[PDB]
Amino acid sequence: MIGITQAEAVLTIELQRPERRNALNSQLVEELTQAIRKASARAIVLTGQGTAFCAGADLSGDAFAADYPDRLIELHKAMDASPMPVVGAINGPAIGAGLQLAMQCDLRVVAPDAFFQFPTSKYGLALDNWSIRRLSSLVGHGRARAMLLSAEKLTAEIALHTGMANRIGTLADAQAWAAEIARLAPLAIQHAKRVLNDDGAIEEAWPAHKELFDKAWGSQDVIEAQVARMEKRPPKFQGA
């Protein structure tokens, strides 16, 4: 579920599953999508309740789990296509699908204890190409290689230094900047936004990327990472 409020010209959308650190499921993703699609508001802020912005994807207990990839695509499609600038107030950690969500925001205001991570190398998973391209664009290639190949965490401070974070601050700060942004010329925002999103980050997986992507997600190592967690021991990966 989600909190929706508007003040003056700023619509604030709050992920409200603080129990599961705002991990995405099918329902949360459908509700966010719907909320982005409306549109009097001239700016959106996306933030999370509790200690996390969004800690990932948690499809356990989600009964419509096979729908999820599709909903996620809808959500990102709606965010990319919205004529509104979306200011992510990243109030704590953005990990996995959460970092992916944070990167789809147009601007970012980040809390000092937040961090960004793609822990795929700890779980044997693979990302879509956009996630990798937009990350490279926001932290620089070199830090992207470390985050992707070694599960390196990007802190708020380094986020600020690279431009992943436009500002360090709180939800109040994000809302104050969104109000100012709410007073600028929409067509100007809308044109820049479209051009920027069409920088080439939106890219179909090449044949080798797809083959490796499927090998990773279909791999036994994926199971071993979860079992290792459950057995309170280190994983023994096999590369299969």
Q: Find the helix or strand (DSSP H, E) in which 43 lies.
A: strand 43-48
**Bridge partners (DSSP) listed for residue 173:** none
Q: Among 19, 61, 233, 239, which residue sits at the site for a second copy (rule: CB under 8 A)?
A: 239
- Scan residues 111-140 and list those touching a second copy (CB under 8 A): 120-127, 129, 132-134, 136-140
192 contacts a second copy (rule: CB under 8 A): yes
Handedness of CA 121, 159, 58, 27 (dihedral sign): negative
What number of CA atoms fall less than 13 Å from residue 154's CA on the CB side?
29
Closest by CA to 103, choosing from 147, 74, 137, is: 137
- Scan residues 29-88 and list those touching a second copy (CB under 8 A): 42, 83, 85
What is the nearest approach in angstroms of a second copy to the Cβ of residue 225? 7
- Scan residues 94-113 and list those touching a second copy (CB under 8 A): 106-108
206 contacts a second copy (rule: CB under 8 A): yes
113 versus 180: smaller Cβ distance to a second copy: 180
Q: Among 63, 191, 223, 229, which residue sits at the site for a second copy (rule: CB under 8 A)?
A: 191
Q: Among 194, 227, 229, 231, which residue sits at the site for a second copy (rule: CB under 8 A)?
A: 194
Number of residues that bind a second copy (CB under 8 A): 77
The two three-digit tokens of residue 66, written as one number: 């096979």
208 contacts a second copy (rule: CB under 8 A): yes
Q: How many helices (H) and strands (E) does the chain have?
A: 11, 9
What is the nearest approach in angstroms of a second copy to the Cβ of residue 123? 7
6 versus 226: smaller Cβ distance to a second copy: 226
How far is residue 105's CA from residue 107's CA, in Å, rounded to a whole number? 6
Neighbours of 46 (CB within 10 A): 28
19 versus 187: smaller Cβ distance to a second copy: 187
112 versus 210: smaller Cβ distance to a second copy: 210
Look at the chain and count its residues: 240
> Is residue 16 within 8 Å of residue 23, measured between CB atoms?
no
What is the nearest approach in angstroms of a second copy to the Cβ of residue 163? 3
Here's the x/- map for a second copy, 212-231, by CB under 8 A: it reads as: xx-xx--x-xx--x------
Rg (CA), the chain: 18
Q: Among 163, 172, 226, 229, which residue sits at the site for a second copy (rule: CB under 8 A)?
A: 163
Q: Among 2, 59, 202, 205, which residue sits at the site for a second copy (rule: CB under 8 A)?
A: 205
Angle between helical axes of 26-37 and 68-81 (0-180°, round to 10) = 20
200 contacts a second copy (rule: CB under 8 A): yes
> Which residues, including other chains, have CB under 8 Å from residue 141's CB and lie 6 or more apart?
none
